[PDB]
């Protein structure tokens, strides 16, 4: 997160860190046994880390649970990042408490101009490089589809939306991939892609979760 703020320990209780010997992507806890992330975050050998603030210190509220299965969306296209969404099933259920909690799936899609909360342990500069140890947060608005399409012509599908600031300075970044965009108490986006981070006229591009609720519910009901 570029241009954000320190969240506060366990104030984003649905945020997870995906670890494959090191933190590599975020995700969101949607019930006691399932996490949503980005398909471009796929790796073998994922451990899900819940209740994290400082990812480099064991502070006492963490739960570390290995993934039993990963399921990339059937229509994921790694070239275009269309359908950039993946489910991860935990080997054992998480214990839900004030520090570890699930986030609701949306019933309706979110509105342009809604201010959302984006969070992660990704890079905090442009191509300066500096990765934080504690969780960072950013408030950012949903941009109109026409502004999104103008910023990335020929690249935006109906399964993507843009959020952030056209002036630049505030954005998600590498390492925040797979993490949440929460608007009005619902998971509306997944950190997906962008040209650089926090560059002028290059806002963040997010997977549109409300287009995937049927797939998520059917997959959880069968696995
Ligand atoms: Ca920790």
Swiss-Prot record:
Subsequent cleavage after Lys-125 leads to alpha-trypsin. Further cleavage after Lys-170 yields pseudotrypsin. A cleavage may also occur after Arg-99. Not sulfated on tyrosine residue(s). SUPFAM superfamilies: Trypsin-like serine proteases. Synthesized in the acinar cells of the pancreas. It is found in: Secreted, Extracellular space. Substrate binds at residues 171-172, 174-175, 177. InterPro entries: Peptidase_S1_PA, Peptidase_S1_PA_chymotrypsin, Peptidase_S1A, Serine_Proteases_S1, Trypsin_dom, TRYPSIN_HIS, TRYPSIN_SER. Disulfide bonds join 7-137, 25-41, 109-210, 116-183, 148-162, 173-197. Pfam families: Trypsin. Keywords: Calcium, Digestion, Disulfide bond, Hydrolase, Metal-binding, Protease, Secreted, Serine protease, Signal, Zymogen. Binds 1 Ca(2+) ion per subunit. Ca(2+) binds at residues 52, 54, 57, 62. Interacts with SERPINA1. The active site is at 40 (charge relay system), 84 (charge relay system), 177 (charge relay system). The keyword Secreted applies. It comes from the Eukaryota. It catalyses: Preferential cleavage: Arg-|-Xaa, Lys-|-Xaa. GO terms for molecular function: endopeptidase activity; metal ion binding; serine-type endopeptidase activity; serpin family protein binding. One of its GO terms (biological process) is digestion. Its EC number is 3.4.21.4. Is inhibited by scorpion cyclotide trypsin inhibitor TopI1. This is Serine protease 1. The keyword Metal-binding applies. It comes from Bos taurus (Bovine). GO terms for cellular component: extracellular space; serine protease inhibitor complex. The lineage of its organism: Eukaryota, Metazoa, Chordata, Craniata, Vertebrata. Belongs to the peptidase S1 family. Its cofactor is Ca(2+).
